[PDB]
Amino acid sequence: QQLASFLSGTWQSGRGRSRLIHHAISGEALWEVTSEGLDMAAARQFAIEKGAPALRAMTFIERAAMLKAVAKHLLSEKERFYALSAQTGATRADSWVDIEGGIGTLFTYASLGSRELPDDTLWPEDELIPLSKEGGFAARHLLTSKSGVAVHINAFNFPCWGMLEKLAPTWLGGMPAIIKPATATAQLTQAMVKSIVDSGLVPEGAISLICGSAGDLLDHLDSQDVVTFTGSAATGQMLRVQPNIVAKSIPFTMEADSLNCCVLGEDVTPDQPEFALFIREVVREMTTKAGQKCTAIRRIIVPQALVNAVSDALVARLQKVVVGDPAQEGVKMGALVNAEQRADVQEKVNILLAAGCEIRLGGQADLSAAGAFFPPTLLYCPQPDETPAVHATEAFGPVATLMPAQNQRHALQLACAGGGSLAGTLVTADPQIARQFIADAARTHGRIQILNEESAKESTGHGSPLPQLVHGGPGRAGGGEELGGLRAVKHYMQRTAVQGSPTMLAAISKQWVRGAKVEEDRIHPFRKYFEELQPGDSLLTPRRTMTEADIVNFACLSGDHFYAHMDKIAAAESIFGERVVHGYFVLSAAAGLFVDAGVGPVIANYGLESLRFIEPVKPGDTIQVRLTCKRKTLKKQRSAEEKPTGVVEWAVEVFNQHQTPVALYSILTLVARQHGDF
Amino acid sequence: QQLASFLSGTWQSGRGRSRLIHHAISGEALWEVTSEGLDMAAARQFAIEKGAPALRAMTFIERAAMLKAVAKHLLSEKERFYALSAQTGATRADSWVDIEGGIGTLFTYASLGSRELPDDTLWPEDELIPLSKEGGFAARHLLTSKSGVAVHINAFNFPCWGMLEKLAPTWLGGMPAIIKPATATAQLTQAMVKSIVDSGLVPEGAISLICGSAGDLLDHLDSQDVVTFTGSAATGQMLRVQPNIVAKSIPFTMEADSLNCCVLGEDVTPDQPEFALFIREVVREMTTKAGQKCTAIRRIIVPQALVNAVSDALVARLQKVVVGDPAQEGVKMGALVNAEQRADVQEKVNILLAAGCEIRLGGQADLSAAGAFFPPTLLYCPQPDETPAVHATEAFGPVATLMPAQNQRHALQLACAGGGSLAGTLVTADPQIARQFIADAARTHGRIQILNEESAKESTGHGSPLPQLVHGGPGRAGGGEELGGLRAVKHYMQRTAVQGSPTMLAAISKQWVRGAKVEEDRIHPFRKYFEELQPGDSLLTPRRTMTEADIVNFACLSGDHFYAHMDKIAAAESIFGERVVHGYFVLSAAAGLFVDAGVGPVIANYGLESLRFIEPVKPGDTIQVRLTCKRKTLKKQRSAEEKPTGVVEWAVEVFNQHQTPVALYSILTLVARQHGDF
Amino acid sequence: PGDTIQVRLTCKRKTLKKQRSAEEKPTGVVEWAVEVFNQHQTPVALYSILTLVARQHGDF
């Protein structure tokens, strides 16, 4: 039953030297995997000629909606994925984290995209940068999709999460994806790819899959493609010096093995809740998915005095973990994915012992049984700062090393001796200890959690990467960065500075910018439905002369009697030199000048975005407002009942009688549409 | 006279095989350069043991002040720099570009840093991310300095701008720098390093200088270091696969040779001003410092019909450029820097001719003269889309190739045929043309300018990278990114997600976050001076019950009679279902509840940052405000006269009587300090 | 109009009130001196206000 790979739009396989996928529990070879003789160049050309322009023609909103649809469809069919995940040696909870976290990543990126990306195919990322004095020359930065294909080489740990956490920003960025899973678990990736393809929800050529070897696919890439790698450091570093990849300046992100730490702060005593949650945390991160997560804890750093009590508690809670076939009731920790991984973990443990580690629990595994089971293992390092192997060697399984520290600073040095890690944890109740730990050791960790009693009730965990937070680390951890919210979307896009006149920048951005041409229409802009509005639709209001009576009435009604408005003596000694009008009254009176009173398309206001008070307004000044439609963003109907709306941002400029701007800001509104999209 | 290297705090030189620095005009060898036998490992250790912690102890405000002081001291002594620049073959305007642009980059980064970086040693880049339902578990992203040293390997084009361009963000990020200029022009870099060092304005070990070869410096770097390279693509791609750099995941960004284009829009005709400014632009970019800038125009793409007119105009304007010794009155364009560079330019021109290019203006130089002069060379390519060498070969001199296009889209394809460029220019007057060009060709360009009549008045240029805009490009341009404002500062820092309870995150951040512990005083916070204020100092105000009278009075005073407030019939079928209170009146009444009236340390309000209206406020509801000090930022006294103030951001939270929030926002404020720092 | 006023509020006289029972809250009577000045610091109004003020400790 050879495993097919989906490329050039067809399901096909290869012929030659194979590899086998065994059952992690029984040991039977239940899949054969090979991709020899497949035209890799044809697959790349297929993804580029028809997948990429199809994705790029969609606006960001349409791509986010497509992410959401795909997530829903994948969620409806999760039972198939659970049944396949059972073959890899996972309990129901590990398959849960993998499956449900991958789909939840899709949902999170869909939400972020809908909420904060433009309704366009281009993405203007910052505000307009003025580069002159009369305003004829300005700049802003834009992001456009790269035109190539994204190749994601994933590791066996998370066959579904590891694919979707990369796939979601790849599509949100507008790029097709060629996915190459790890051979040892490709059967679970294939089924999810087949589900996505058979849903009909994504464009043709937007997703390809290589089961087996990539062949010479990297030799055919050019500078508009991107490559991401997850796995062993040797394979990644070999890929990093790929002659084609270095000749074309192809972006390459690497995520290697890291030695994640968990530190116990000096301030805690064994009679505190922090001690118990620390023990529970170390055990959970040691034992979930048999400790095969990239973020699983590998080094435990405790104060010298606490070592014996900590070791007693760890072995006590850790002996109560039953390893076996999760289909049996009473099993809490399954097996490694194959006997090869078991041999690798055993030889790493043997290296650590040969380099000066004592067994506290279960160092040797049954290296002959059918299932790839490993017993939970807790090691001890007595000379932590002169045993350099414990800071470089990572057994990729339920194995962790306890080690002592001193004076709360030796612990920081030991945490940094890892050489760059993905995740670290500090259990403490003292906020100053946590400040010191961050300021000293954040530079070697990609993610750090301070774990006290309050955070422990809803904390997601030491080993769980959330889609909103970056996932990566320096040095030993590869150097790359994933999952930083929209930070990940930007890795599939080119950033470009665009210089020119404001009017040109407005036309290019499809958003109005300061100083650009406007259009006046003799119909108030608040009477136009969403579709009739264009950026640059502008209204000059009538004037209102400020008076002393306005200062008095506003101070009274609001209750703000700040001396700058109500005290002549104190105002004379201020920077302005006399009494001025309240800034909030300038804001309110401006709204009074431009707001259309009667029922119309404008539904809500709900938001003001960047208000600066530039010049003071005095009694005797006359103010006037220009209201320009700045940006529009359609909102997708989440049902057939909801009335179709869109978001409109408006630029507001308040001028005095010298045409001098005295206030600048944006308002957000909800505006109704004439045509919904169900 | 041998050029010294400043490493380990001492001025020293090397002994062995040397390179010679010849005068570009006369040809005399006036410097000898070698660094053999210098302890590079000692230099790096000197940078990281005393330069790096010294820079890291400074807040971003102090490092910005140090940048400004260094820029001033450099500007005062610019005559020496101009004199050493004369030796390189530069007219007064080219040296002005280099010297004043480098110093202006320092000034700009000082300004950006003092204006928008925290008064701390850590940089919290984003707002708090809630990760729980009850608010016990959240996260935000921090940036902290890396521990290592930054090695900047610079090119000969811009010996002053090329160093300070990288040095400003390196220091602002808290990293020591080791500068390695190009040997051919290291005399100008040495003098600027001498100025900086004998100024006494920077910490010890914050800048080192290697004149000549780098020896084995790259072999001794670890994961906390960063490397940058500008120059030849072969040398950079060799550095990219340096075995130590790849084994340790050391960040490495490369900038190489790019074929910058300049398209003429289909809309323009010879009778338009666009045509004249297009000619002027191509000629200025061709002849400024002999066309030796990385952003010089190399490919001119015009419509097939305009080809002969453009070729007449370019030749005419370009014969008027007098090349010679710029010390002679009447010279407009100087020499190249070396006879070696002149030979390289000549052989690139010969390759282009051998690949099918027509001479339009002189293309043969004097390969025996003492000065390294090259005449302005304008080539012609008759069949642009089938001679691939015109899109791959770059003569680093006063050489540019004219080529024809068709149908407005062949020109876009030609622009993209360069394989990734730093800069491109489109001359047009039609904004739709500009939008099409951007949307299709931004992905292969790092910077693009739309050049019309309005922008021509104050346009800084095609070839001048401004410090606010990114400087880089994909593919053939190396793939790197520089100068993007604070974007470049973040390349010398590590980004880290920190999860925990809001109280822990507030301690780590030194800024109050939503949900964190506050502290109340019995003294109103607005009566405290800057130094007495602490993030989290908080005031619960008294309550104000909203009535129908308040709605009527505010609508009357402000003029806003929007139906949701004043029309009970229309409000009946709104989403709220009855009349509500104006959001701006909620804002004003909140200010009335918390603002202290009497003269105190609070000087100005001037700002409101992120206002959302969460829930409607109805008549009969009672509101109460919690005002919390969120973030403090000291402002440096720019004289001894001005009063010392600081910037305080305040968190405002308005609650109704169910303790439900109805408005959240921040106010900015100027607060007087007790003690200035002159 | 154009004059600026400022007030000094001074506690003038305190008089404790005996609790009628063990139930009623213990208050006292405070008379306050009020002095309103204009910007030449000359007084423009003088008067006293009476006030009921809550006590911390009753005497049943």
Domains of chain A: 5-257+487-493 (3.40.605.10), 261-477 (3.40.309.10), 495-672 (3.10.129.10)
SS (H, E, C) A534-585: CCCEEEECCCEECCHHHHHHHHHHHCCCCHHHHCHHHHHCCCCCCCCCCHHH
Dihedral, CA atoms, B570, B574, B577, B578, nearest 10 degrees?
Answer: -50
Mark out the alpha helices in A404-547 (DSSP H runs): 410-416, 431-441, 486-489, 502-509
- Asked if the C-beta of A569 comes within 8 angstroms of chain C's C-beta atoms, the answer is yes
- Give the integer Cα–Cα distance in Å for A393 and A391: 6
The span from the CA of B256 to the CA of B71, in Å, is: 28
Compute the distance between CA of residue B127 and CA of residue A368 in angstroms, rounded to an integer.
53
User: Which is nearest to B662 in space by CA: B583, B554, B609?
Assistant: B583
Neighbouring residues of A117: CB distance < 8 A, sequence distance ≥ 6: A60, A61, A64, A123, A172, A486, A489
Amino acid at B50: K
Contact call for A588 and B558, based on CB within 8 A:
yes
Nearest CA in chain A to C38: A569
- CA angle A423/A425/A431 to nearest 5° reads 130
Residue ranges with strand state E in A177-303: 177-180, 207-209, 226-230, 252-255, 260-264, 297-303
Pairing of β B150-153 and β B226-230:
parallel
Residues with Cβ within 8 Å of A667's Cβ and at least 6 positions away in sequence, in order, are A605, A607, A608, A609, A649, A650, A652
> In a mutagenesis test of the A interface, which of B412, B491, B496, B596 is the best target, namely the one with the most A β-carbons within 10 Å?
B496
Q: What tokens does A262 get? A: 């968990």
What is the spatial distance between Cα A507 and Cα A505, in angstroms, rounded to a whole number? Answer: 5
Rounded to whole angstroms, the Cα distance separating A216 from A44 reads 11
- Which positions of A are annotated as active-site residues? 255, 294
Which residue has 């899109």 as its token pair?
B391
User: Tokens 């993998």 identify what position?
Assistant: A98
CA distance A47 to A53: 9
Q: Which two tokens stand for residue B672?
A: 């007087």
Name residue, tokens 């019939």: B569
Contacts with B139 from chain A: Cβ below 8 Å: 466, 468-469
Measured CA distances, A512 to A507, A647, A667, B457, B468 (Å): 8, 15, 14, 22, 21
Is residue A29 helix, strand or coil?
strand
Element (H, E) at A98: helix A92-116
CA-based nearest residue to A509, from A113, A104, A119: A119
Residues near B211 by beta carbon (within 8 Å), at least 6 away in sequence: B3, B4, B5, B13, B33, B35, B181, B183, B186, B189, B190
Of A394, A191, A316, A416, nearest in space to B146 by CA: A416
A479, HSE (Cβ side, Cα atoms, 13 Å) = 25
Angstrom distance (rounded) from CA B427 to CA B264: 5
The continuous run of DSSP H or E covering C33 comes out as strand C27-37
- Residue B377 forms beta bridges with which residues? B399
Q: Do B496 and A222 touch (CB under 8 A)?
A: no
Helix (H) or strand (E) holding A170: helix A161-172
**Residues in A touching C4 (Cβ below 8 Å):** 567-569
Nearest CA in chain B to A421: B496
**Which residue in the set B449, B469, B611 is minimally distant from A500, CB to CB?**
B449
A-chain CB neighbours of B570 within 8 Å are 599
The answer to whether residues A605 and A589 touch, using CB atoms and an 8 Å cutoff, is: no
**Residue A610 in contact with partner chain B when CB distance is under 8 A:** yes
Which one-letter amino acid corresponds to residue A20? Answer: L
User: Which chain B residues contact residue A150 at CB under 8 A?
Assistant: none
Angle at which helices B431-441 and A502-509 cross, to 10°: 60
In terms of DSSP H, where are the helices of B448-576? 453-456, 486-489, 502-509, 548-558, 563-566, 568-572
Cα(B130)–Cα(B596) distance, integer angstroms: 32
CB A429 within 8 A of CB A265: yes
Name the one residue in this structure whose structure tokens are 């021109």.
B349
Answer for the pair A172, A485: CB distance below 8 angstroms, yes or no: no
Q: Chains touching chain A at 3 or more Cβ pairs under 8 angstroms?
A: B, C
B319 close to A (CB below 8 A): no
Residue B25, number of CB atoms within 10 A of its CB: 21
| Resolution expressed in Å | 2.3
Q: What is the four-CA torsion angle of B28, B31, B32, B35, rounded to 10 degrees? A: -150
CB atoms within 10 A of CB B251: 18
Token code pair at residue A162: 């590891």
Exposed/middle/buried for A33, CB within 10 Å: 0-12, 13-18, 19+? buried
Q: Under a CB-based contact definition with an 8 Å cutoff, are residues A40 and A216 in contact?
A: yes
CB atoms within 10 A of CB B212: 24
Structure tokens at A225: 């493609």
Long-range contacts of residues B437-442, Cβ cutoff 8 Å, at least 24 apart: B437/B263, B437/B412, B438/A122, B438/A142, B438/A144, B438/A496, B438/A498, B438/A508, B439/A121, B439/A122, B439/A144, B440/B412, B440/B416, B441/B412, B441/B415, B441/B416, B442/A122, B442/A142, B442/A144, B442/A494, B442/A496, B442/A498
Q: How far lies A455's CA from each of A449, A450, A459, in Å? A: 9, 8, 6
Q: How was this structure determined?
A: cryo-EM
Q: Hey, is the C-beta of A619 within 8 angstroms of any chain C C-beta?
A: no
Task: Decide: A159 and A185 in contact? Cβ < 8 Å.
Answer: yes
CA distances from A18 to A39, B204, B247 (A): 17, 61, 31
- Which residues in chain C are closer than 8 Å to A569, comparing Cβ atoms? 4, 39
Q: At what angle do helices B548-558 and A583-594 cross, to 10 degrees?
A: 80
Specify the 3-state DSSP secondary structure of A450.
Answer: strand
A 10 A CB-CB count for B125 gives: 13
State how far residue B479 is from chain A, nearest Cα, in angstroms: 6
What are the beta bridge partners of residue B333? B323
- In three-state form (DSSP H/G/I as H, E/B as E, the rest C), the secondary structure along B41-99 is HHHHHHHHHHHHHHHHCCCHHHHHHHHHHHHHHHHHCHHHHHHHHHCCCCCHHHHHHHH
For A219-247, b/e burial (b = at least 16 CB within 10 A) is: eebbbbbbbbbbbebeebbebbebeebbe
- Residue B344 to residues B12, B323, B336, B349: CA-CA distances in angstroms? 32, 19, 11, 9
C-alpha–C-alpha distance, residues A407 and A389, integer Å: 23
CA distance, residue A125 to nearest chain B CA (Å): 12
Q: What SS3 state is found at A168?
A: helix
Q: Do A606 and B613 touch (CB under 8 A)?
A: yes
Q: Which two tokens stand for residue B291?
A: 């066309």
Contact flag A144-B457 (C-beta cutoff 8 Å): no
Least Cα distance to B641 among B610, B676, B606 occurs for B676
DSSP of B135-195: S--EEEEEEEE-SS-EEEE--SS-TTHHHHHHHHHHHHTT--EEEE--GGGHHHHHHHHHH
Cβ partners under 8 Å of residue C17, min gap 6? C26, C27, C28, C29
* Inter-chain CB proximity B241 and A241 less than 8 Å: yes
Position B648: which residue type? V
Q: Tokens 């250790």 — which residue? A: B45
B629: which strand partners? B650
**Pairing label, strands B399-405, B297-303:** parallel
Rounded to whole angstroms, the Cα distance separating C18 from B69 reads 72
User: How far is residue A581's CA from residue A616's CA, in Å, rounded to a whole number?
Assistant: 7
- Tokens coding B10: 């001492």
Please identify which of the residues B62, B255, B394, B482 carries the catalytic annotation: B255
Residues in chain A: 678
Instruction: For residue C55, give how far its alpha carbon lies from the nearest alpha carbon of chain A (Å).
Output: 30
Q: Which two tokens stand for residue A605?
A: 């206001």
Positive or negative, the CA dihedral B314, B320, B324, B326 is: negative
In sequence order, what are the beta bridge partners of A252? A227
Distance separating alpha carbons of residues B188 and B82, to the nearest angstrom: 9
Q: Kindly determine whether residue A588 and residue B583, on different chains, have CB atoms separated by under 8 Å.
A: no
- What length does chain C have? 60
The CA distance from B462 to B531, in Å, is 47
Does residue A603 sit at the B interface (CB-CB below 8 Å)? yes
Residue where the block lists tokens 């297929």: A46
Location of structure tokens 């709360």: A408
